[PDB]
């Protein structure tokens, strides 16, 4: 499948090779939950782990399913 990544200058999406089928989007308020806040991360994965709200990651089993929450649609 294809997931969104943020491990570069601009955010893009690639096709995970024989290893990952799910995508992930990390979120956690950086010392600015008011202004900056929830830092947004991106990447592909095979499983879907869980953690405390302080550091959570949304995992999906679809394509382009892990985009920025504030990404301008359209």
């Amino acid at each position: 499948i294809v997931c969104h990544t943020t491990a570069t200058s601009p955010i893009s999406a690639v096709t995970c090779p024989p290893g990952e089928n799910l995508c992930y989007r990390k979120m956690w308020c950086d010392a600015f939950c008011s202004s900056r806040g929830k830092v947004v991360e991106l990447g592909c994965a095979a499983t879907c782990p869980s953690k405390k709200p302080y550091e959570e990651v949304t995992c999906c089993s679809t394509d382009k399913c892990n985009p920025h929450p504030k990404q301008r649609p359209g």
């Binding site: 600015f32 900056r36 806040g37 929830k38 830092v39 947004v40 504030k70 990404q71």
Partner: peptide, 13 residues
């Protein structure tokens, strides 16, 4: 680096 929920702009660590 990564991005914050605020905007889609890049953010140095």
């Amino acid at each position: 680096w990564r991005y914050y929920e605020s905007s889609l702009e890049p953010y140095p660590d």
